[PDB]
């Protein structure tokens, strides 16, 4: 399925994952598209922080879903 990821700057990214995909895996995909270290990425869905030990189906994430990405340490510019 396809999902969307919005940033704090106002940028939407499209990724193709599977219901059996782990959160950690999703972070890697974003690190290859933007280059943001997984240790510096915070995913949020429905106001809930996703774990790197859980999958997408565990959060009941369907296709066309939108996720929020938060950077730690305040990367800024």
């Amino acid at each position: 399925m396809q999902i969307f990821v919005k940033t704090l700057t106002g940028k939407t990214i499209t990724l193709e994952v599977e219901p059996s995909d782990t959160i950690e895996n999703v972070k890697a995909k974003i690190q290859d598209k933007e280059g943001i270290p997984p240790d510096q990425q915070r995913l949020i869905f429905a106001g809930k922080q996703l774990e790197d030990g859980r999958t997408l189906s565990d959060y009941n994430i369907q296709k066309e879903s939108t996720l929020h990405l938060v950077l730690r340490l305040r990367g800024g510019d």
Binding site: K6, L8, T9, G10, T12, T66, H68
Partner: protein, 141 residues
């Protein structure tokens, strides 16, 4: 917080500037209100990342000041369209459905029915909400 971060959450807004300014003019008077970027899933199921103003507004009643929590939603184009207000009641609050509030929390005020943009703004909308809520409390401990 910060004006820069505000212009970032509303980067996908047809009318950023306007929105921003208006927002800045709001949180300025009501510090109890802060902007936030979240996904708004309409009833049709569709979803969209919009910027709403979550917080509480002072509404004097019986000599007591009640900080009624609200949530204004702005659509990619809130410069001409009225925001989607909502009374987020706490576990210690009970919505008192009336003429400006239903069972879902939705707010109903002439300011929304007759929204333009040249004279209608958030500040004006909030001020009007305090006046109406003052005479008609949408909630009660």
């Amino acid at each position: 917080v910060s004006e820069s971060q505000l212009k970032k959450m509303v980067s996908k807004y047809k009318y950023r500037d306007l929105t921003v300014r208006e927002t800045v003019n709001v949180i300025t008077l009501y510090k109890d209100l802060k902007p936030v970027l979240d996904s708004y899933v309409f009833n049709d199921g569709s979803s969209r990342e919009l910027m709403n103003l979550t917080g509480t507004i002072p509404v004097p009643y019986r000599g007591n000041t009640y900080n009624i929590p609200i949530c204004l939603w702005l659509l990619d184009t809130y410069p001409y369209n009225p925001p989607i207000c909502f009374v987020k009641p706490t576990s210690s609050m009970t919505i008192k459905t009336g003429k400006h509030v239903d069972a879902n929390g939705k707010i109903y005020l002439p300011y929304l029915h007759e929204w333009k943009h040249p004279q209608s703004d958030l500040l004006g909308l909030i001020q009007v909400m305090i006046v109406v809520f003052g005479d008609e409390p949408p909630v009660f401990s």
